[PDB]
Amino acid sequence: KVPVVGIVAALLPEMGIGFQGNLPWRLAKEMKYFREVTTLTNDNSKQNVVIMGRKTWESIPQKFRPLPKRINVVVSRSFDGELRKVEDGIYHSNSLRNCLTALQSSLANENKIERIYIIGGGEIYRQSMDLADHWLITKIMPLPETTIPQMDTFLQKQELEQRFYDNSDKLVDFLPSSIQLEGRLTSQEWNGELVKGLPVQEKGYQFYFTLYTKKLEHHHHHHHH
Numbered sequence: 001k002v003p004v005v006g007i008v009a010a011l012l013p014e015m016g017i018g019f020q021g022n023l024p025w026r027l028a029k030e031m032k033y034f035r036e037v038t039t040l041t042n043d044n045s046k047q048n049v050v051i052m053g054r055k056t057w058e059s060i061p062q063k064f065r066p067l068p069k070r071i072n073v074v075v076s077r078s079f080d081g082e083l084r085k086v087e088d089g090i091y092h093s094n095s096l097r098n099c100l101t102a103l104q105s106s107l108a109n110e111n112k113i114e115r116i117y118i119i120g121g122g123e124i125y126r127q128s129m130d131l132a133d134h135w136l137i138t139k140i141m142p143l144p145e146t147t148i149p150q151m152d153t154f155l156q157k158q159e160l161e162q163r164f165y166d167n168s169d170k171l172v173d174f175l176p177s178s179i180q181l182e183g184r185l186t187s188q189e190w191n192g193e194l195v196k197g198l199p200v201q202e203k204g205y206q207f208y209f210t211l212y213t214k215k216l217e218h219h220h221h222h223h224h225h
């Protein structure tokens with residue numbers, strides 16, 4: 001009953017997302033987007049959750065974690081529970097799946113989570129294709145004289161485009177209502193793929209804010225008592 005939204009910055013056409021434990025670029029504009037979307041709420045009395053695997057958590061600079069003004073969840077199999085406060089702004093979980101069910105209980109959450117953002121990394125994302133309702137994917141492309149950075153971690157585009165369709169026509173309406181975006185929506189061919197979303201350029205790169213949504217599903221079974 002609260003939306004689960006995967007959120008990621010990926011380099012086309014392989015959807016590379018990391019190299020040696022870090023992000024393969026540093027794009028202040030893309031960071032600001034991620035910051036604002038995961039922070040901001042339509043309802044001022046709620047926060048969002050950001051869920052991340054242990055290795056992602058360890059890569060965030062120390063002064064910047066836990067990410068402010070959001071409920072942070074870190075998942076490690078060597079942690080104790082489903083969902084345990086360990087510090088102000090910090091929960092530990094030994095289970096991606098059980099922590100989401102725990103987060104969804106209106107009794108625990110008092111209907112004061114707006115959305116649950118899954119913020120990485122590779123392993124966490126692999127596991128989120130059948131959990132997320134939507135994906136917010138920043139599609140990044142090096143400009144013509146930009147060197148393609150090396151990378152070692154990938155979003156599963158196959159499984160992506162299996163389960164979700166490109167709903168970037170609704171991206172603007174989907175974002176919290178006070179975010180402001182520099183570009184208008186824009187369909188552009190790039191190395192044999194349709195790239196649709198909201199353009200920016202920074203450093204050696206062009207990127208598009210896009211939204212993917214779950215495809216429609218046939219009615220095979222509903223559970224009856």
Ligand SMILES: NC(=O)C1=CN([C@@H]2O[C@H](COP(=O)(O)OP(=O)(O)OC[C@H]3O[C@@H](n4cnc5c(N)ncnc54)[C@H](OP(=O)(O)O)[C@@H]3O)[C@@H](O)[C@H]2O)C=CC1
Pocket residue numbers: 007008009010016017018019020021022023024052053054055056057059075076077078093094095096097119120121122123124125127153
């Ligand atoms: N471009 C982007 O938007 C983003 C990219 N990244 C990139 O991703 C890379 C990191 O990804 P990756 O190395 O795969 O690591 P993750 O951040 O996905 O962490 C993986 C760790 O998470 C824990 N974990 C995984 N599944 C579960 C589960 N079901 N339940 C409980 N714990 C679980 C385990 O911790 P343990 O070993 O402790 O048991 C595991 O080793 C880096 O390069 C980083 O820069 C990260 C965020 C965003």
Ligand SMILES: COc1cc(-c2c(C)cccc2C)cc([C@@H](C)C#Cc2c(C)nc(N)nc2N)c1
Pocket residue numbers: 007008009021022023030031034052056059060061064067118119120137138
């Ligand atoms: C790997 O090490 C990281 C460092 C930071 C980080 C840095 C480098 C500087 C200041 C503050 C922070 C939090 C953040 C992240 C993660 C949580 C991410 C992400 C993300 C981004 C950036 N964009 C889109 N679209 N989706 C995302 N999940 C990882």
